[PDB]
Design a binder for this molecule. Structure first.
Ligand SMILES: [Zn+2]
Length: 255
């Protein structure tokens, strides 16, 4: 599976039949149809105690993993019940600035999309969480091209060390708080993982306010390789999934 012509999102249903399930993500967010729900509590992001370990290229993107052996970097509140632990963060981006996000807002595509992946601590581990309907919480942040994002530069500078599939580099002391927009206003809905196995275990929290990144930042992203080291080079670009049918589900807004 990949994002090419022969193994792309239009082909995932053959090995992952759930690809056409009832709560597939991403989706388009209709801001006029989205329901303002007064009972939504503020998001609670506790990341001051976060511990990054490493960054790796798994062939579909780059992941920054964190130590989730203790409640160090957690998400709670909002539409969530219980504590969710940050396990990893990654992005989705395009070959151009006109495309890249997974989630769309009134059909508008953003240059990239940041996902902070957290799991419900009631299930003990990530693996047990991916089987539960309320097992994961993913925080989505859109990226637009404009002014550089200081907090993002440590990531960009390390990409050259993990250009090809399978590479990894130690990546300690990175603070995720530098990737957060100013406002915590959000939209929430029940969805799924966006890459195979596409399990329908996520509670999506998409921030309203996007973060700006500069052209040269995003550019360093487009320089990654889908392929393994020593193989014909396939630029890692357009690693996003097309919007899926909402099918009945309702999108709530905290604003
Ligand atoms: Zn993602």
């Amino acid at each position: 599976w990949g994002y090419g012509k022969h193994n792309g999102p239009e082909h995932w249903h053959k090995d992952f039949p759930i690809a056409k399930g009832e709560r597939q993500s991403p989706v388009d967010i209709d801001t006029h149809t989205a329901k303002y729900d007064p009972s939504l509590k503020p998001l609670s992001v506790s990341y001051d105690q976060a511990t990054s370990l490493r960054i790796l290229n798994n062939g579909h993107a780059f992941n920054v993993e964190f130590d989730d052996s203790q409640d160090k970097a957690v998400l709670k509140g909002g539409p969530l019940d219980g504590t969710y632990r940050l396990i990893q963060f990654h992005f989705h981006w395009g070959s151009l600035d006109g495309q890249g996000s997974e989630h769309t807002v009134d059909k508008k595509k953003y240059a990239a999309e940041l996902h902070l992946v957290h799991w419900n601590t009631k299930y003990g581990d990530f693996g047990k969480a991916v089987q539960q309907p309320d097992g994961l919480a993913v925080l989505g942040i859109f990226l637009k091209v404009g002014s550089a994002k200081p907090g993002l530069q440590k990531v960009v500078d390390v990409l050259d060390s993990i250009k090809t599939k399978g590479k990894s580099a130690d990546f300690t002391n990175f603070d995720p708080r530098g990737l957060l927009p100013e406002s915590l206003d959000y939209w929430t809905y029940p969805g799924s993982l966006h890459t195979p196995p596409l399990l329908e275990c996520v509670t999506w929290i998409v921030l309203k306010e996007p973060i700006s990144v500069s052209s040269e930042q995003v550019l360093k992203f487009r320089k990654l390789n889908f392929n393994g080291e020593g193989e014909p080079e396939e630029l890692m670009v357009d690693n996003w999934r097309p919007a899926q049918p909402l099918k009945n589900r309702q999108i709530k807004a905290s604003f």
